[PDB]
Amino acid sequence: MTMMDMNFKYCHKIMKKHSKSFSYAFDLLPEDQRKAVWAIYAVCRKIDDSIDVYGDIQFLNQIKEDIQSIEKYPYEYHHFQSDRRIMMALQHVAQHKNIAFQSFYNLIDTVYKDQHFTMFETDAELFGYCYGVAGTVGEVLTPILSDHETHQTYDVARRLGESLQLINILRDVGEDFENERIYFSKQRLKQYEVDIAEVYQNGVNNHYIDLWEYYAAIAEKDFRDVMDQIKVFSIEAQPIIELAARIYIEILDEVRQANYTLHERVFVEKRKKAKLFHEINSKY
Ligand SMILES: O=P(O)(O)[C@@H](CCCc1cccc(Oc2ccccc2Cc2ccccc2)c1)S(=O)(=O)O
Ligand SMILES: [Mg+2]
């Protein structure tokens, strides 16, 4: 094992620990591709979690400055300020692939802003946030997942990221509420006559179910559009992306089966992930 191998193994550890779904699917990529995906995942995870290290922006600004140094001087040796293992891996990736650095900056900007979180007035703001935290990641992954990137490749990867984030939101209503976060828009909450606090206390009702399903239908339509355009991705990535998306969308059914509970995090068991791999692997 080389030093650079050690860096990518650490990135792999982070991904496996935090997302059983995405690790399960993306670990099926060819070696060079899955290592790049691990490095991208680990950078994004570190960004996502940066505020709680100290309680402020300091680690986030370090990550940002590390990414900036890679962008400006990808073939120079850097003394990284944040997580060296991850940044060395990211830099290695940057040497071989055309990374959308502004997408990392858009994600960092979204994390900074989230410090002053106020509820989304409209769905447009909710979808802007989905772009910021997940559509951005889709854009970063695009050159890894395709041979010849076009605007469509980015569009589809963006829509995928946004669909996956909306599913995450739909899974985590209760937990987010405990953490003083509600992601459904004020406009829709008012239209559907839903008070998340009231529902967390008293259980589901038809108004809440209708609202949850309104958003679930959006995620499902997004998912279908991505599947319909899956051929933007390289032949090797196509089944992996399909698997990842299918495993993640199965979470919607898990929520329904658990009666839309606000009090546990539902999950797709490993054996069911394998069932989906079989179905997809057979298709290809
Ligand atoms: O904002 P937090 O912190 O609440 C939240 C942070 C997570 C935000 C998010 C949600 C969903 C999907 C995302 O990225 C993708 C976009 C397009 C395609 C694939 C992927 C998955 C992927 C990422 C990298 C490498 C491989 C796979 C990102 S959380 O902690 O994970 O829930
Ligand atoms: Mg969540």
UniProtKB/Swiss-Prot annotation:
Keywords: Carotenoid biosynthesis, Magnesium, Metal-binding, Transferase, Virulence. (2E,6E)-farnesyl diphosphate 2 binds at residues 45, 165. Mg(2+) 2 binds at residues 168, 172. Pathway: Carotenoid biosynthesis; staphyloxanthin biosynthesis; staphyloxanthin from farnesyl diphosphate: step 1/5. Disulfide bonds: none annotated. Binds 2 Mg(2+) ions per subunit. A third Mg(2+) ion binds between the 2 farnesyl diphosphate (FPP). This is 4,4'-diapophytoene synthase. It comes from Staphylococcus aureus. The gene is crtM.
